Amino acid sequence: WTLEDFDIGRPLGKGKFGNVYLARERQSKFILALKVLFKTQLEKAGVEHQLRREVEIQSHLRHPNILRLYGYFHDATRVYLILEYAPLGTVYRELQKLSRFDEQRTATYITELANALSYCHSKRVIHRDIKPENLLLGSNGELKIADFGWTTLCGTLDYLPPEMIEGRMHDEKVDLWSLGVLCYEFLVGMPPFEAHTYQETYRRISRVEFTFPDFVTEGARDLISRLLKHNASQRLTLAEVLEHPWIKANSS
Amino acid sequence: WTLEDFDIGRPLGKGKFGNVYLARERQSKFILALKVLFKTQLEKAGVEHQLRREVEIQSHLRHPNILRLYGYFHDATRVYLILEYAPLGTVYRELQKLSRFDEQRTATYITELANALSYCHSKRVIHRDIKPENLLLGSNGELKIADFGWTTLCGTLDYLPPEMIEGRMHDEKVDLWSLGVLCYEFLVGMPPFEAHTYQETYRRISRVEFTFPDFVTEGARDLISRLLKHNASQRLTLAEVLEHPWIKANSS
Ligand SMILES: COc1ccc(C(=O)Nc2ccccc2)cc1NC(=O)CCSCc1cnc2[nH]ccc2c1
Ligand SMILES: COc1ccc(C(=O)Nc2ccccc2)cc1NC(=O)CCSCc1cnc2[nH]ccc2c1
């Protein structure tokens, strides 16, 4: 592949995904997304080799609920990622449109997430920030994980390992908590610990302090409460999520 | 214990450790450190219960290379930690004094660190930021771990679990990297990836880009290089550190 193989169209995501463009492969007329990475920025961050490792794994993955990397190429000053285009936009945008999701839509999205995340763990695929703005929607409305782009909260910089500074610390126990947050946000319209100030959000997370609105059913409450456990080892696993009665009863 | 049992003296650490004071138990004349925590700040951070869990474990620990918590008490607006006083100050201060440490001093400190960290892992003791300013020195010059006080680097706040926001992500693989950084800093006088800007330090960590000065011996180079591995699973374990020939040859 070369740059000349593509017609570059409108920018996508208002910069939330980096320099990404709607594109068309000139000979096949196939619609896709092209992400442009600047070598100078990759070099200044020291991530060139980490990028190569991640894209090598991704280019071999195929899963209906993970955004596909079809391939990649480079020139003198840029690296180009050939990505699947999700025509229905982000789950964030859908949530904005509907205010909140019904139990069917939610349980279906949670199943797709649990499947995508399980697959990522088994294939050793790093993902970075599970949130509605990073979840995309395919032609049939199927959810696709797309969270692959990239004193501190982990301590002092000079002493921190690569996995901390490269955002590679979302393991399966972390993801379990994220899935509870997402389940709640899908049904309610906001994440459970949301507050005006960062300080107050911190407090609510640490205390696991949240309330269900009246419309949230007993089955959904059970699932969410069993995921949002302060103790990581006590959180309901991805396999157990897929077997939960509320998920079984409501998933398409 | 009550506040009235103690004479409170000079503040310690220039605020780097919070509100900490040199103190004396009035009846026994025993010298110790008293740390004052304000309930209002604990409550605003949502950490009251996490504090209780951590101090319960600590109050039962005894190890020559871990700073001891003798006990604790509270009143209407404060929590008080009764801590061991380390009379020789921080390893940071010692490094400032000497510029760099010889192989004997370094290997001895690394052994004490590896012992302290091993014990922490086995007893499930959370520690937060391994660096010279957080390492203290006892009456005989023995090293004591004291790192127990507390968009992001881990992603978006609303979706992050308690273990990320509470600084509880330093597991044994993270600690292995930290131990390599410390070994280098002890021998050289600065950590290996130190640079004027945060961006450049990030780059050097991600690339694992560092150089040994000529005076660093083959055995020390081997130890450091086997700890500073980009891949976490490839780092030399704490048991293997204690068995390393350079450590055996030089540790007191
Ligand atoms: C598989 O995907 C990715 C693979 C790799 C990277 C990446 O940047 N890796 C990296 C960079 C530097 C250092 C290390 C690693 C990013 C993505 N994915 C995205 O960036 C989000 C979708 S952009 C496309 C897209 C599609 N369909 C849409 N529909 C609406 C908006 C939209 C936007
Ligand atoms: C075992 O130790 C600790 C136990 C608990 C905590 C803590 O704050 N926990 C916490 C707080 C809020 C939420 C959750 C958890 C801190 C320490 N340790 C220190 O704070 C550093 C040494 S202060 C004493 C000391 C001694 N000896 C010195 N020599 C020179 C200076 C100096 C300074």
Side-chain angles (χ1 to χ4, degrees):
Chain A
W1 296 112
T2 57
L3 221 211
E4 296 72 25
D5 288 319
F6 303 95
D7 297 309
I8 306 155
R10 68 180 187 87
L12 303 169
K14 238 157 164 196
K16 303 286 186 187
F17 300 127
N19 278 253
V20 183
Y21 303 91
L22 190 63
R24 178 186 271 110
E25 208 271 63
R26 295 183 95 167
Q27 282 130 114
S28 63
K29 305 200 276 85
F30 190 74
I31 295 151
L32 50 84
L34 197 70
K35 180 169 182 155
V36 180
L37 302 165
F38 304 127
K39 256 121 171 248
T40 189
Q41 293 185 315
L42 293 169
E43 280 158 31
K44 288 189 178 204
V47 297
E48 316 99 280
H49 286 236
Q50 185 59 34
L51 169 67
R52 180 173 73 244
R53 275 180 272 113
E54 288 182 36
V55 296
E56 276 171 11
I57 296 158
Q58 292 186 52
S59 69
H60 292 251
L61 308 178
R62 272 200 270 235
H63 189 105
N65 304 301
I66 296 168
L67 194 75
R68 197 183 167 188
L69 173 71
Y70 299 117
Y72 56 90
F73 58 103
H74 69 90
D75 59 28
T77 68
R78 293 161 175 188
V79 176
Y80 303 88
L81 267 33
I82 308 156
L83 304 175
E84 176 185 359
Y85 174 63
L88 271 58
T90 64
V91 174
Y92 173 79
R93 184 189 184 193
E94 189 168 54
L95 196 62
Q96 228 160 29
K97 169 162 139 260
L98 302 172
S99 306
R100 59 191 202 239
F101 302 154
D102 66 24
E103 297 196 296
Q104 184 183 50
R105 193 185 282 276
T106 301
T108 307
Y109 286 162
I110 299 301
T111 298
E112 289 169 339
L113 272 149
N115 288 335
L117 290 164
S118 295
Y119 187 79
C120 281
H121 305 138
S122 66
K123 291 221 157 273
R124 300 180 185 183
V125 187
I126 295 146
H127 74 95
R128 293 195 159 80
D129 197 18
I130 288 295
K131 68 181 172 171
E133 280 194 279
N134 286 157
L135 304 170
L136 292 170
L137 294 165
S139 182
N140 303 117
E142 65 274 68
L143 176 155
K144 291 170 193 284
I145 286 183
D147 64 320
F148 302 109
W150 195 241
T151 315
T152 77
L153 201 51
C154 301
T156 303
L157 184 63
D158 275 291
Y159 307 87
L160 303 182
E163 61 266 24
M164 290 185 152
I165 68 156
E166 291 163 15
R168 294 160 38 221
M169 292 231 65
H170 290 237
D171 64 3
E172 78 174 329
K173 302 297 168 295
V174 168
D175 288 342
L176 264 19
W177 176 280
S178 293
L179 193 67
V181 177
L182 272 52
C183 193
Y184 184 100
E185 187 178 4
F186 291 162
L187 294 161
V188 175
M190 74 187 122
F193 312 108
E194 193 181 78
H196 181 67
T197 67
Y198 72 84
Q199 295 96 319
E200 181 60 12
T201 303
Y202 274 87
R203 197 195 108 277
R204 286 168 189 203
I205 295 170
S206 283
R207 289 275 274 166
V208 195
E209 185 182 304
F210 70 101
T211 62
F212 292 106
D214 237 81
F215 59 78
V216 181
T217 68
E218 177 166 31
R221 286 177 190 227
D222 188 74
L223 207 213
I224 291 170
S225 287
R226 289 189 194 270
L227 270 20
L228 301 183
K229 287 300 220 284
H230 190 274
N231 191 105
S233 70
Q234 284 174 175
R235 295 174 193 146
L236 191 83
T237 74
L238 294 175
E240 294 173 330
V241 171
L242 296 164
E243 213 78 299
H244 187 98
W246 184 83
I247 292 295
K248 288 174 72 180
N250 298 279
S251 194
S252 297
Chain B
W1 296 112
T2 57
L3 221 211
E4 296 72 25
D5 288 319
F6 303 95
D7 297 309
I8 306 155
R10 68 180 187 87
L12 303 169
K14 238 157 164 196
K16 303 286 186 187
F17 300 127
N19 278 253
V20 183
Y21 303 91
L22 190 63
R24 178 186 271 110
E25 208 271 63
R26 295 183 95 167
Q27 282 130 114
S28 63
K29 305 200 276 85
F30 190 74
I31 295 151
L32 50 84
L34 197 70
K35 180 169 182 155
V36 180
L37 302 165
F38 304 127
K39 256 121 171 248
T40 189
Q41 293 185 315
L42 293 169
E43 280 158 31
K44 288 189 178 204
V47 297
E48 316 99 280
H49 286 236
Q50 185 59 34
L51 169 67
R52 180 173 73 244
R53 275 180 272 113
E54 288 182 36
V55 296
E56 276 171 11
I57 296 158
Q58 292 186 52
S59 69
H60 292 251
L61 308 178
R62 272 200 270 235
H63 189 105
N65 304 301
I66 296 168
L67 194 75
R68 197 183 167 188
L69 173 71
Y70 299 117
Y72 56 90
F73 58 103
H74 69 90
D75 59 28
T77 68
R78 293 161 175 188
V79 176
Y80 303 88
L81 267 33
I82 308 156
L83 304 175
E84 176 185 359
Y85 174 63
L88 271 58
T90 64
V91 174
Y92 173 79
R93 184 189 184 193
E94 189 168 54
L95 196 62
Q96 228 160 29
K97 169 162 139 260
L98 302 172
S99 306
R100 59 191 202 239
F101 302 154
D102 66 24
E103 297 196 296
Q104 184 183 50
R105 193 185 282 276
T106 301
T108 307
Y109 286 162
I110 299 301
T111 298
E112 289 169 339
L113 272 149
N115 288 335
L117 290 164
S118 295
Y119 187 79
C120 281
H121 305 138
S122 66
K123 291 221 157 273
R124 300 180 185 183
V125 187
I126 295 146
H127 74 95
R128 293 195 159 80
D129 197 18
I130 288 295
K131 68 181 172 171
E133 280 194 279
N134 286 157
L135 304 170
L136 292 170
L137 294 165
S139 182
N140 303 117
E142 65 274 68
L143 176 155
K144 291 170 193 284
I145 286 183
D147 64 320
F148 302 109
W150 195 241
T151 315
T152 77
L153 201 51
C154 301
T156 303
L157 184 63
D158 275 291
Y159 307 87
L160 303 182
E163 61 266 24
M164 290 185 152
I165 68 156
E166 291 163 15
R168 294 160 38 221
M169 292 231 65
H170 290 237
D171 64 3
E172 78 174 329
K173 302 297 168 295
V174 168
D175 288 342
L176 264 19
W177 176 280
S178 293
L179 193 67
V181 177
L182 272 52
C183 193
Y184 184 100
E185 187 178 4
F186 291 162
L187 294 161
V188 175
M190 74 187 122
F193 312 108
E194 193 181 78
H196 181 67
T197 67
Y198 72 84
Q199 295 96 319
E200 181 60 12
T201 303
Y202 274 87
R203 197 195 108 277
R204 286 168 189 203
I205 295 170
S206 283
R207 289 275 274 166
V208 195
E209 185 182 304
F210 70 101
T211 62
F212 292 106
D214 237 81
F215 59 78
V216 181
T217 68
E218 177 166 31
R221 286 177 190 227
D222 188 74
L223 207 213
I224 291 170
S225 287
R226 289 189 194 270
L227 270 20
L228 301 183
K229 287 300 220 284
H230 190 274
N231 191 105
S233 70
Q234 284 174 175
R235 295 174 193 146
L236 191 83
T237 74
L238 294 175
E240 294 173 330
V241 171
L242 296 164
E243 213 78 299
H244 187 98
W246 184 83
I247 292 295
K248 288 174 72 180
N250 298 279
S251 194
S252 297

